[PDB]
C-alpha positions as YAML, in Angstrom:
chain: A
units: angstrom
residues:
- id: 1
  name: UNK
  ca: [52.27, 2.74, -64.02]
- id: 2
  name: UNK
  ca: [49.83, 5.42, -64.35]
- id: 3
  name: UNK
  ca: [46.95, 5.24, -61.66]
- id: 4
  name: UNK
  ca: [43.49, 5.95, -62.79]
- id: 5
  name: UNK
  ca: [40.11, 5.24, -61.15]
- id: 6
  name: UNK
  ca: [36.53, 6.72, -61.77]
- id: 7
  name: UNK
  ca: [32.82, 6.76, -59.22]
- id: 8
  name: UNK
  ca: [29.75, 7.93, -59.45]
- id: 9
  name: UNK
  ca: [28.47, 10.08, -56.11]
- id: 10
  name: UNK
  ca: [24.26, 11.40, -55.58]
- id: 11
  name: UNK
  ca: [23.98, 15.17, -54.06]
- id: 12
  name: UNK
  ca: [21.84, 14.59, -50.75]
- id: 13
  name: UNK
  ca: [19.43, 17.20, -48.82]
- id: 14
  name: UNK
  ca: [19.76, 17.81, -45.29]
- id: 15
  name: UNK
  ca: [16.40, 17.27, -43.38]
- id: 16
  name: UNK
  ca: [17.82, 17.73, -39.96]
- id: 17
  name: UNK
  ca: [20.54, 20.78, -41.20]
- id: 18
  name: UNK
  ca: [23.99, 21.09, -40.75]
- id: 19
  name: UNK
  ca: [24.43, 24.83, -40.15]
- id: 20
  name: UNK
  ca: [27.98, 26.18, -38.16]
- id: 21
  name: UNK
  ca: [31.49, 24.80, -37.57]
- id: 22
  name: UNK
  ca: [33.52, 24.00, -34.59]
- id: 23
  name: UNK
  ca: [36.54, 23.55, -36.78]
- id: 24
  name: UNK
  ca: [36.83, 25.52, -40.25]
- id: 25
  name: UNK
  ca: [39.90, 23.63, -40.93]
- id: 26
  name: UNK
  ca: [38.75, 20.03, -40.64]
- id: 27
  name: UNK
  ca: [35.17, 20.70, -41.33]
- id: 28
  name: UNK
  ca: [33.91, 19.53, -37.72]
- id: 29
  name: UNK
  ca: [30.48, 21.01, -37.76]
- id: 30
  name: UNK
  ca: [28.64, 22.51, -34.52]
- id: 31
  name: UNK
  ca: [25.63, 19.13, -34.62]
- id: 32
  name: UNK
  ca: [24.96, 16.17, -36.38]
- id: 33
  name: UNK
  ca: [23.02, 16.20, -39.61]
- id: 34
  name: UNK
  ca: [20.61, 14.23, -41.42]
- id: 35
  name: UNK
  ca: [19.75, 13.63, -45.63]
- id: 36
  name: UNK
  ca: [18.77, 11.65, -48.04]
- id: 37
  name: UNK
  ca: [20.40, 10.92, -50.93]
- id: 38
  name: UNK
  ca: [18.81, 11.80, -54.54]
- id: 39
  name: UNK
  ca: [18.83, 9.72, -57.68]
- id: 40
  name: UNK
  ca: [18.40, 12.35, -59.75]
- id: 41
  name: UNK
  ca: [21.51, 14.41, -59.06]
- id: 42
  name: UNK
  ca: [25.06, 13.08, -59.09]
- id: 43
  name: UNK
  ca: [29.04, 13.67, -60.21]
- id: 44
  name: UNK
  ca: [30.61, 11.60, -61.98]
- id: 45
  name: UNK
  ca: [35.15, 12.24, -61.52]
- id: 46
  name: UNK
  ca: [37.39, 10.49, -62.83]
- id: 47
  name: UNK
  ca: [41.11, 11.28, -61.49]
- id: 48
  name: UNK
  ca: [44.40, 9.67, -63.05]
- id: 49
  name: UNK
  ca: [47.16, 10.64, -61.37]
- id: 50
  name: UNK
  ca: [50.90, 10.29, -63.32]
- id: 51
  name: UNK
  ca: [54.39, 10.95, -62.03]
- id: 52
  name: UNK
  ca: [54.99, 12.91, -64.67]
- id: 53
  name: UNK
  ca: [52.12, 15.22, -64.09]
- id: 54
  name: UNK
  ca: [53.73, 18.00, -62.18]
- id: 55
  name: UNK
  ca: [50.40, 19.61, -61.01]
- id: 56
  name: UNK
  ca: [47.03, 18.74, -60.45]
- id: 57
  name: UNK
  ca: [44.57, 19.63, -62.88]
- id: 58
  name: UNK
  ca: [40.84, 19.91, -62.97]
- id: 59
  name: UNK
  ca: [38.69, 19.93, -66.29]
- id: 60
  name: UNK
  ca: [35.17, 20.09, -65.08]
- id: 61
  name: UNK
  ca: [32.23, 19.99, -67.34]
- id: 62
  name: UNK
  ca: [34.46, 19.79, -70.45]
- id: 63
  name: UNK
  ca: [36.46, 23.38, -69.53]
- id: 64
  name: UNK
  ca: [39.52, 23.93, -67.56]
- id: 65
  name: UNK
  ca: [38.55, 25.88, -63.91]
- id: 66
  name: UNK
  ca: [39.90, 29.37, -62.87]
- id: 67
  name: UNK
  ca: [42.61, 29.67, -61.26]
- id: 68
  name: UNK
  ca: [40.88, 29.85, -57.71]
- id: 69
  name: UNK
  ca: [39.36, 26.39, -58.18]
- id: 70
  name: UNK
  ca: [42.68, 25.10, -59.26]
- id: 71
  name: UNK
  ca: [44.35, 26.22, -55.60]
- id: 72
  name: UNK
  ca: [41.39, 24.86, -53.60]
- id: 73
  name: UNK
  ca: [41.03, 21.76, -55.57]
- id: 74
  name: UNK
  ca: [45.21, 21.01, -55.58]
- id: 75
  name: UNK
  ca: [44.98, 21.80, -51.32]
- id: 76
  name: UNK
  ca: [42.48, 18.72, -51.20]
- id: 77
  name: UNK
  ca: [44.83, 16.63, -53.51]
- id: 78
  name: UNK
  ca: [47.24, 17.43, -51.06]
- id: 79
  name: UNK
  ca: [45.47, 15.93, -48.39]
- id: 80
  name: UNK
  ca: [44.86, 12.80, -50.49]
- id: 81
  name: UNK
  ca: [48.78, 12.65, -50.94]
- id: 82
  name: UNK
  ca: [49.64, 12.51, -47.40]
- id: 83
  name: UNK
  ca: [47.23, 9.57, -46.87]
- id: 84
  name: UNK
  ca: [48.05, 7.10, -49.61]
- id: 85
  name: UNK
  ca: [51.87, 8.57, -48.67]
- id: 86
  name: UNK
  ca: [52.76, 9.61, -52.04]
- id: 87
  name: UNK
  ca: [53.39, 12.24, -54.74]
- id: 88
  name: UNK
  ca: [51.94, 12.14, -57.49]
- id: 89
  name: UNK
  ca: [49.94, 14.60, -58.89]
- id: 90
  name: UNK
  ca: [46.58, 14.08, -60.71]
- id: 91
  name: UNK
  ca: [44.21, 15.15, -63.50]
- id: 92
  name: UNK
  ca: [40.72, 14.96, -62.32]
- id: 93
  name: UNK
  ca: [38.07, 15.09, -65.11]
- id: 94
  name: UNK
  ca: [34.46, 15.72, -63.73]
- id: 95
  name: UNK
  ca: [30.84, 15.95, -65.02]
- id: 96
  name: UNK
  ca: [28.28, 17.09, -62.65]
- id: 97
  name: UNK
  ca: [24.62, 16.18, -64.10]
- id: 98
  name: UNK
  ca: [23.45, 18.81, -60.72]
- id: 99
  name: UNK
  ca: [21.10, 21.46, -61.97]
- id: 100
  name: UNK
  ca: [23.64, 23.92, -60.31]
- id: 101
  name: UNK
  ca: [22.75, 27.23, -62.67]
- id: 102
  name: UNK
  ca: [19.43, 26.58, -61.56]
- id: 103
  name: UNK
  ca: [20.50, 26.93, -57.63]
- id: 104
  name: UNK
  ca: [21.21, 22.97, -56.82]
- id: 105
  name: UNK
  ca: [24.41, 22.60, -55.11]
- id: 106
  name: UNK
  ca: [26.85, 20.20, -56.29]
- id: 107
  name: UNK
  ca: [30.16, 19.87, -53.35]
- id: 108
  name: UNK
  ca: [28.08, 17.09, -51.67]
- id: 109
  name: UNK
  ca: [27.99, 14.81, -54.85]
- id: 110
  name: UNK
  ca: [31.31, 16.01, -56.30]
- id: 111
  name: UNK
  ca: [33.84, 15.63, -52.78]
- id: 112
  name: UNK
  ca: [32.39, 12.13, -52.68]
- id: 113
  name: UNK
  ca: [32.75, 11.39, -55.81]
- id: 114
  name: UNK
  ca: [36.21, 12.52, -56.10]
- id: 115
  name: UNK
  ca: [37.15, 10.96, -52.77]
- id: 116
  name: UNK
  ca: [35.50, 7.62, -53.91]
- id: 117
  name: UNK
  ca: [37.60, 7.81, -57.05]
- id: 118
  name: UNK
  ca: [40.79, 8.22, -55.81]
- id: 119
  name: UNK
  ca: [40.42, 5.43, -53.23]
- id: 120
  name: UNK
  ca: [39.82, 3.09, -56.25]
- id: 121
  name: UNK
  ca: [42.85, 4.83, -58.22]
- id: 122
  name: UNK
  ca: [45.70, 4.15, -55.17]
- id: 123
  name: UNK
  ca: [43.96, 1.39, -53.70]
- id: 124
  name: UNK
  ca: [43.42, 2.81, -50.42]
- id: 125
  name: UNK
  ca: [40.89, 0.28, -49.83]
- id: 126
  name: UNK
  ca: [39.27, 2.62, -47.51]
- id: 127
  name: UNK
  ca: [36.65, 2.01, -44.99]
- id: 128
  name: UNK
  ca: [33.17, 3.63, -45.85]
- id: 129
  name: UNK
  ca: [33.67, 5.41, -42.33]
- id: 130
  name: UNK
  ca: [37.42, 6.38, -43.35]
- id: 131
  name: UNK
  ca: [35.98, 7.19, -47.22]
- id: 132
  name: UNK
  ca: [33.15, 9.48, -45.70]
- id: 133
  name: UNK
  ca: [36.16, 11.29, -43.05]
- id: 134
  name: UNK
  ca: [38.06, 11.94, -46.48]
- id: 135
  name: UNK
  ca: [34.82, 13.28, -48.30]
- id: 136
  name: UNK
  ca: [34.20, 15.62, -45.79]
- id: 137
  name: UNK
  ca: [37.55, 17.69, -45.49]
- id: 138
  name: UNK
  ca: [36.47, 18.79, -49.34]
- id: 139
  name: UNK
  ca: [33.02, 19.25, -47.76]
- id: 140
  name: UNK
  ca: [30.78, 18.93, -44.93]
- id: 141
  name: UNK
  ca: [27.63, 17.53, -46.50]
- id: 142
  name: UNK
  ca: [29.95, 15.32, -48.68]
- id: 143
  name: UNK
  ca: [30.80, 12.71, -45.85]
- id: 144
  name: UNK
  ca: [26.84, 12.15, -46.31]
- id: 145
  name: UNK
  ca: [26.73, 11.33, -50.20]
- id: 146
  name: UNK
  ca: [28.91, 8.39, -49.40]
- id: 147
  name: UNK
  ca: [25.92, 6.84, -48.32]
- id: 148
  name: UNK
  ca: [22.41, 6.02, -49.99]
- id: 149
  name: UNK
  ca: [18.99, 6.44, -48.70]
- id: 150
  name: UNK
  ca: [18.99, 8.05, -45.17]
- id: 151
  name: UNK
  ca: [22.44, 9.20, -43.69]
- id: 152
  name: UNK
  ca: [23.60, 11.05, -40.12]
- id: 153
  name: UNK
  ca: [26.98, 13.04, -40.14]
- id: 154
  name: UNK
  ca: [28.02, 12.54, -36.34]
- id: 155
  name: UNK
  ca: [29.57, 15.23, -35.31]
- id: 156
  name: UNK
  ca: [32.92, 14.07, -33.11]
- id: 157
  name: UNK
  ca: [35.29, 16.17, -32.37]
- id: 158
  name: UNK
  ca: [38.39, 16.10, -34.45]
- id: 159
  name: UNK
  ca: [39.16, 14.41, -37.62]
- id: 160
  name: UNK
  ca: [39.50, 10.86, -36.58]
- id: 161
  name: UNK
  ca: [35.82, 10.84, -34.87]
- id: 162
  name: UNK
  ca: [33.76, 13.23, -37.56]
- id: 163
  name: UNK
  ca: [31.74, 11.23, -40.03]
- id: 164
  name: UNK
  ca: [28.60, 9.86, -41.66]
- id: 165
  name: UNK
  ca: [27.01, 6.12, -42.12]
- id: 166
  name: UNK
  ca: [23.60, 5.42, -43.25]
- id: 167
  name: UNK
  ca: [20.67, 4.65, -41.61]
- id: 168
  name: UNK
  ca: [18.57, 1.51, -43.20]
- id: 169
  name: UNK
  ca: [15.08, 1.98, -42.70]
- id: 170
  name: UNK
  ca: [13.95, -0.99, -44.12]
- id: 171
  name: UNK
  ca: [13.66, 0.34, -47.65]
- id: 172
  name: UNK
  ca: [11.29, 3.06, -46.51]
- id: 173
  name: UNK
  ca: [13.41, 5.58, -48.75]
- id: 174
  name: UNK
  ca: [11.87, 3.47, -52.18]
- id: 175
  name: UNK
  ca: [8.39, 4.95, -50.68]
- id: 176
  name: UNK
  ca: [9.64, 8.73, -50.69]
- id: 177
  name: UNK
  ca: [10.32, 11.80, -53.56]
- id: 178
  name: UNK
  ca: [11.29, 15.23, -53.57]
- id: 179
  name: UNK
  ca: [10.30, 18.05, -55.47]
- id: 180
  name: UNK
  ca: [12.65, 20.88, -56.56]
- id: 181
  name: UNK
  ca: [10.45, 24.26, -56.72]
- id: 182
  name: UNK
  ca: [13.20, 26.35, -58.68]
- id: 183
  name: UNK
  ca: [12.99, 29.66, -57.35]
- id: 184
  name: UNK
  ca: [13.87, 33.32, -59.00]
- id: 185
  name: UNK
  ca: [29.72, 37.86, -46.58]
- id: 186
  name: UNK
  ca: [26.48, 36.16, -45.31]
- id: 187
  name: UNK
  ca: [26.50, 32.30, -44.35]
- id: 188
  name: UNK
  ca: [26.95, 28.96, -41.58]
- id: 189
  name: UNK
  ca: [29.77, 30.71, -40.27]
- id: 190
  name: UNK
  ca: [28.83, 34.58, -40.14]
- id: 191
  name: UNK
  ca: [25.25, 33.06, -38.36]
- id: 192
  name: UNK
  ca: [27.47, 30.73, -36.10]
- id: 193
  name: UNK
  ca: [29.69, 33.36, -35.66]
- id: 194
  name: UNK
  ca: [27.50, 36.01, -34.57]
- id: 195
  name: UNK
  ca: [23.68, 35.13, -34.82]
- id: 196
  name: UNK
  ca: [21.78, 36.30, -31.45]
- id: 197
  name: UNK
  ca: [19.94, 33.26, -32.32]
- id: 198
  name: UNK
  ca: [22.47, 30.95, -32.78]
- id: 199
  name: UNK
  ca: [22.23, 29.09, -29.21]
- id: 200
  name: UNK
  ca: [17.91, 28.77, -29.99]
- id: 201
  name: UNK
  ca: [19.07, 26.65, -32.91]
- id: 202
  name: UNK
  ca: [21.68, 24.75, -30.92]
- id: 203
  name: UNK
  ca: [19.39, 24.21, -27.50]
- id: 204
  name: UNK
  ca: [16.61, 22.31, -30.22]
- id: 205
  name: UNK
  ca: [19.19, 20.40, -33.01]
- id: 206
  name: UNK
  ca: [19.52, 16.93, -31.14]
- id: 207
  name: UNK
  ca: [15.86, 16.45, -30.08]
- id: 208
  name: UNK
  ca: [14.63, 16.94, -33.44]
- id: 209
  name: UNK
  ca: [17.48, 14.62, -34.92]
- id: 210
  name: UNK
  ca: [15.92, 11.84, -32.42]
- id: 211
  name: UNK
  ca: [12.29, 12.57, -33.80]
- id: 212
  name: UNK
  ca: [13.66, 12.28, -36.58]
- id: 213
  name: UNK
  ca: [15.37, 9.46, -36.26]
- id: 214
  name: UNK
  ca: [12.65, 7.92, -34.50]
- id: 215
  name: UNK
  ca: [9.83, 8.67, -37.09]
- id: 216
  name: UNK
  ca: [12.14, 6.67, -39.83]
- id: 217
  name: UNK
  ca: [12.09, 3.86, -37.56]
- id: 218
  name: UNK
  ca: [8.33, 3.72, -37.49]
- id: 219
  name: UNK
  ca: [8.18, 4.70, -41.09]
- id: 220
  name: UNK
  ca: [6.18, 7.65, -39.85]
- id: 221
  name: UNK
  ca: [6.29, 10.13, -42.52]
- id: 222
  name: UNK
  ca: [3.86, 13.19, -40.96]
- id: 223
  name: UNK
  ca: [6.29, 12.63, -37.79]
- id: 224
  name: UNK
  ca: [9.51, 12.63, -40.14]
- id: 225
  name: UNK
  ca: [7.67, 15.99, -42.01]
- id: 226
  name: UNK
  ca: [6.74, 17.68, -38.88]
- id: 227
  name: UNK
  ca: [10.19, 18.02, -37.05]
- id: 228
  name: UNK
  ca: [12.30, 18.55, -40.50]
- id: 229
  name: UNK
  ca: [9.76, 21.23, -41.29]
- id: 230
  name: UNK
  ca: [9.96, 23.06, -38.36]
- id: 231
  name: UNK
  ca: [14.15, 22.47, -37.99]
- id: 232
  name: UNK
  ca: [14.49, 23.69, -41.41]
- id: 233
  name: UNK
  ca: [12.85, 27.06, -40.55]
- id: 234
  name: UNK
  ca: [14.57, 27.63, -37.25]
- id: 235
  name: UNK
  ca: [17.62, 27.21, -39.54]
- id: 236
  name: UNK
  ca: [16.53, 30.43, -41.22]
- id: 237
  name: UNK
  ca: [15.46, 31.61, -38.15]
- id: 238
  name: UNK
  ca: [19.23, 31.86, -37.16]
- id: 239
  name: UNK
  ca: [20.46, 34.23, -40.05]
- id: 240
  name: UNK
  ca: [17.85, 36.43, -39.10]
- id: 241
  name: UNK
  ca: [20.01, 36.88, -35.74]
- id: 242
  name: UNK
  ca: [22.98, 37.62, -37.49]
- id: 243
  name: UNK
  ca: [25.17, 40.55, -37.16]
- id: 244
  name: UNK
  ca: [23.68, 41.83, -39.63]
- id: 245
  name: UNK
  ca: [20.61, 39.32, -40.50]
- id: 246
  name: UNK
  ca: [20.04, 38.20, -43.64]
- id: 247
  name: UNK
  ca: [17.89, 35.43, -45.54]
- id: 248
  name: UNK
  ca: [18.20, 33.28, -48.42]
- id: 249
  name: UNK
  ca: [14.22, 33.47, -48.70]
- id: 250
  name: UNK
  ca: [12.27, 35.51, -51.52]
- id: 251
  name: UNK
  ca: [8.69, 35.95, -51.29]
- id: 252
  name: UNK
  ca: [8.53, 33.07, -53.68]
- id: 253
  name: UNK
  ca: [9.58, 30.36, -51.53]
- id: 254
  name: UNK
  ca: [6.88, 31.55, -48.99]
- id: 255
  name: UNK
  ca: [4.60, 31.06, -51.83]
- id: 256
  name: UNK
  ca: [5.68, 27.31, -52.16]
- id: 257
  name: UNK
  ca: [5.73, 27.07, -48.62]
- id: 258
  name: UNK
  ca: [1.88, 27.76, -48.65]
- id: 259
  name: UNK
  ca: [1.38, 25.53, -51.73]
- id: 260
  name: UNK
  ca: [2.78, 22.76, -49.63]
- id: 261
  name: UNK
  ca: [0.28, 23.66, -46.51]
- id: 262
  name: UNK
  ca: [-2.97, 23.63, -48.65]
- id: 263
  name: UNK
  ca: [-1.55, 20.35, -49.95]
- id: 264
  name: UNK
  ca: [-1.77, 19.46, -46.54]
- id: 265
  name: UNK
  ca: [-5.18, 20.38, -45.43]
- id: 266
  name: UNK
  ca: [-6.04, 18.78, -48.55]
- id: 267
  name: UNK
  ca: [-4.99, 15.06, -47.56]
- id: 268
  name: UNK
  ca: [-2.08, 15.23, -49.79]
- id: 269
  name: UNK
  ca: [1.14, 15.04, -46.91]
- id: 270
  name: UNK
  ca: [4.23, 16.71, -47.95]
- id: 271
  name: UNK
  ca: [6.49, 19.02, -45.99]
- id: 272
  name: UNK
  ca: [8.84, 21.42, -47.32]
- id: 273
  name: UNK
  ca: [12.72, 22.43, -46.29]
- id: 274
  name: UNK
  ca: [15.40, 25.42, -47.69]
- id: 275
  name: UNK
  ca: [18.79, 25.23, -47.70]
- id: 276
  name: UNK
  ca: [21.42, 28.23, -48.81]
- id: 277
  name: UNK
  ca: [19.12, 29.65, -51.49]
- id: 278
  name: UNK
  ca: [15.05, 30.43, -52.28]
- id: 279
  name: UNK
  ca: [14.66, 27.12, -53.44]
- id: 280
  name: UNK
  ca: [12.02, 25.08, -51.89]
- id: 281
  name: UNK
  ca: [12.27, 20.69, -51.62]
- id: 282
  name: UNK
  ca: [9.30, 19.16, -51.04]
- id: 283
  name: UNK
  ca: [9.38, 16.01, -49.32]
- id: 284
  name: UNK
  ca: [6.52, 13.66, -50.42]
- id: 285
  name: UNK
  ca: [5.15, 10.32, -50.56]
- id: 286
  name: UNK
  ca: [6.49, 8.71, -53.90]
- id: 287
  name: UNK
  ca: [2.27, 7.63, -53.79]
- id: 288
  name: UNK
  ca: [1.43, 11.19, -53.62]
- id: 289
  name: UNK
  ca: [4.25, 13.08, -55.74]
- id: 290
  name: UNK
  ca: [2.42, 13.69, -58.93]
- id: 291
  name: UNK
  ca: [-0.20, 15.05, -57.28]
- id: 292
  name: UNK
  ca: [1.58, 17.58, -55.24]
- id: 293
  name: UNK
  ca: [3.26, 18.40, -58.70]
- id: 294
  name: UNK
  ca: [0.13, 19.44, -60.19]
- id: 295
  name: UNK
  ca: [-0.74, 21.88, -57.41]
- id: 296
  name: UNK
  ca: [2.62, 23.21, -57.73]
- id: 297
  name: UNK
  ca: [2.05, 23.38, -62.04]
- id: 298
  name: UNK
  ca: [-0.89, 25.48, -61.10]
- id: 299
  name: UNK
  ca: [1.33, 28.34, -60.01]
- id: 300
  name: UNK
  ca: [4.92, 27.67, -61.29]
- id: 301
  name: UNK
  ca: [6.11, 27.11, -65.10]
- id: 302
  name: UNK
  ca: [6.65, 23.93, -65.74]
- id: 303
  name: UNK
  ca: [10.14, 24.04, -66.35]
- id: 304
  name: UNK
  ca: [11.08, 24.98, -62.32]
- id: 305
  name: UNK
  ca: [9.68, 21.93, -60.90]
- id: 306
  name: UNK
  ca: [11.77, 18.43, -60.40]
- id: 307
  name: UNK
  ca: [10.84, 14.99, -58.80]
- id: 308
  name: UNK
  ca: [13.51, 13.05, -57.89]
- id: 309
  name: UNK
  ca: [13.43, 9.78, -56.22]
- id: 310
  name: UNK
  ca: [15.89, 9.24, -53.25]
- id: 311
  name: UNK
  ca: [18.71, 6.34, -53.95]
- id: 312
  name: UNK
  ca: [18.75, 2.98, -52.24]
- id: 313
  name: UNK
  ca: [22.71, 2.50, -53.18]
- id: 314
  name: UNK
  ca: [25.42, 5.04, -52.22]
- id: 315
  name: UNK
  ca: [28.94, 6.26, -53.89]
- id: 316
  name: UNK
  ca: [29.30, 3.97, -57.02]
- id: 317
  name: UNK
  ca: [33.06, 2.82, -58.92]
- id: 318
  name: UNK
  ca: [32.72, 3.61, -62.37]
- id: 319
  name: UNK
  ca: [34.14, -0.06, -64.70]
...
């Protein structure tokens, strides 16, 4: 009578960002968003829950979490409760094989992950729509790691209509890589708060996602690179605006940045994006990633750059 159930979930990068909230309390974000999913990066969670247990309890990477971790992860749990309409409470037991101390985030893959594995503990027999709505109350980018390959958060409006599904492209993501240049208050919601530049990033957000959209369709890769390149940076662009500005950019990840330009001019395509933090992903050609590598060896140790291939398959059950 004890319920148990375990999944495997990818981290994903956002090409077309998700930056600002409507709703802070349901996660509703401000535009839609588009990743890809990375087979190099992923949670695995298992969660057992036991009536007997009479809180939840989260051992991540082997150790017991503060006690911080333990309120925010028991107020998800809670959610989880009132869906399946019960009361039990459950230990979760998660590995996260995300480079994290080296800057990679790991909510995406670990949300899903946990979401995943508590549909297949309680039987929920949730929709992937429904699994990606429950993902993404733990964390925005999270509804998108339910899904493989390419993926678009839609925005909605309220909980019912705010949620990812993946895009095929007709295998195109077997064809693409990313790099990982590691890289030697403030956030989404101070920018979309206050950031004089704030309605500049929202005035631009859907055309891009279109180009976007539309250069997958045609398998256009300079097309994809062009617009992600250029949304990325007006991204930054925003936190600039800020009350007061601020940047996650050191002169480092300019240096990638013009790594990844002479790459260019020197018939080797690749186009580079930034998320919360000086690292720099580098979108390339799975034809072309060692390649861009090298140039990138030239300059950084060898240690702070990572390939990874993007996933076909999305959020996995664990047997």
């Amino acid at each position: 009578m004890v319920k148990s159930g375990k999944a495997r979930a990818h981290t994903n990068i956002a090409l077309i960002k998700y930056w600002g909230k409507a709703d802070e309390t349901y996660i509703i974000p401000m535009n839609n968003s588009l990743s890809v999913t990375l087979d190099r990066f992923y949670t695995e969670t298992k969660v057992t829950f036991d009536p007997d247990f009479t809180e939840d309890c989260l051992i991540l990477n082997g150790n017991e979490v503060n006690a911080k971790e333990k309120e925010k992860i028991q107020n998800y749990m809670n959610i989880v409760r009132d869906l399946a309409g019960n009361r039990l409470h459950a230990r979760i037991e998660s590995e996260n094989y995300v480079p994290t101390a080296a800057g990679l985030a790991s909510s995406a893959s670990a949300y899903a992950a946990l979401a995943a594995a508590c549909n297949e503990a309680l039987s929920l027999n949730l929709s992937d729509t429904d699994l990606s709505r429950l993902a993404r109350r733990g964390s925005g980018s999270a509804s998108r790691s339910i899904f493989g390959g390419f993926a678009e958060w839609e925005k909605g409006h309220d909980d019912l209509t705010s949620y990812a599904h993946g895009i095929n492209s007709n295998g195109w993501e077997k064809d693409l890589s990313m790099i990982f240049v590691v890289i030697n208050r403030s956030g989404m919601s101070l920018t979309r708060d206050t950031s004089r530049f704030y309605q500049y990033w929202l005035d631009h957000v859907d055309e891009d996602l279109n180009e976007a959209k539309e250069a997958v369709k045609n398998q256009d890769f300079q097309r994809l690179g062009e617009v992600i390149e250029a949304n990325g940076l007006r991204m930054h662009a925003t936190n600039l605006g800020a009350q007061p500005p601020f940047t996650y950019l050191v002169q480092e990840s300019y240096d990638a940045m013009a790594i990844v330009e002479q790459c260019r001019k020197a018939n080797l395509p690749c186009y580079f994006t930034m998320d919360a933090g000086p690292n720099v992903k580098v979108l390339v050609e799975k034809k072309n990633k060692q390649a861009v590598m090298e140039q990138f060896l030239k300059v950084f140790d060898e240690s702070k750059i990572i390939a990874s291939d993007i996933i076909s398959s999305g959020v996995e059950i664990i047997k």
